[PDB]
């Protein structure tokens, strides 16, 4: 996550298509779950801390 690239958030991307999501926490580009706004790593870390309500370990 390069700091200049956090220019990602833009009210004026100049095009809707140039708009891409990032991780709100670590700034990761790839693997960003839309539901949590996080990336997958952060997702697992916070899920493990219990800071994501309702999120539990799944087994079946």
């Amino acid at each position: 996550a390069r700091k200049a690239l956090i220019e990602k958030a833009k009210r004026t991307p100049k095009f809707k298509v140039r708009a891409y999501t990032r991780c709100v926490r670590c700034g990761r580009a790839r693997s960003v779950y839309r539901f949590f706004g996080l990336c997958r790593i952060c997702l697992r870390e916070l899920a493990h801390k219990g800071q994501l309500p309702g999120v539990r370990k799944a087994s079946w």
Binding site: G37, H48, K49, G50, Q51, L52, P53, G54, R56, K57
Partner: protein, 206 residues
């Protein structure tokens, strides 16, 4: 490369979420971001009070924010002005205009995060790591605590080669679901690098 986080392992039974609220799919990510900003501002402020945990609850436009601290006298301030300024920062960050509470932690040595923070501090002050660990485990064990474990990571003593020092006693059954093991983690930023500190405390079973 093993050993999943014990809290995350136990979240269903003998552990409960730090943030408990419901939200929709168009809501969740936002409230989560908010909670994160809250914890992030709180932890970089209230550290000197030794916060072991931050709980967050919501219904509608209202947030619990129950802060667990070893020394509430710090978060209160003089006559309660500190908590005032903190609620001010809270309302300035999130416009929700919500409440705040302070719960004292009896025996801070029985809560893992604080123990880890202790050992971390000692390491940052250039203590003897091995004895810091053994001591900490001792202090944890002497008060309740059917089991305890403390783990320090590499570059112990500023050594060129990373090492891992152990020091655990009692019972720490990580594989038992009903264990109720508090876990905590603290860094140490030193001149030569970073040290990880893990703390396991086993209290009671069923």
């Amino acid at each position: 490369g093993n050993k999943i986080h014990p809290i995350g392992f136990r979240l269903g039974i003998t552990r409960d979420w730090e943030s408990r609220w419901y939200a929709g799919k168009k809501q969740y990510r936002h409230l989560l971001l908010e909670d994160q900003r809250i914890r992030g501002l709180l932890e970089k402020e209230l550290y000197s009070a030794g916060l072991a945990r931050v709980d967050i609850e919501r219904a509608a436009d209202n947030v619990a924010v129950t802060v667990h601290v070893a020394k509430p006298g710090v978060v209160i301030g003089r006559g309660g002005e500190r908590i005032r300024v903190l609620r001010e920062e809270l309302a300035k960050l999130t416009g929700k205009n919500v409440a705040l509470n302070v719960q004292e932690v009896q025996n801070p040595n029985l809560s893992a995060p604080l123990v880890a923070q202790r050992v971390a501090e000692q390491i940052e002050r250039r203590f003897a790591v091995r004895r810091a660990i053994k001591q900490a485990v001792q202090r944890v064990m002497e008060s309740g605590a059917k089991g305890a474990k403390v783990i320090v990571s590499g570059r112990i003593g500023g050594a060129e080669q990373a090492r891992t020092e152990w020091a655990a006693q009692g019972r720490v059954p990580l594989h038992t679901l009903r264990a109720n093991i508090d876990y905590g983690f603290a860094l140490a930023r030193t001149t030569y690098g970073v040290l990880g500190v893990k703390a396991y405390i086993f209290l009671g079973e069923v």
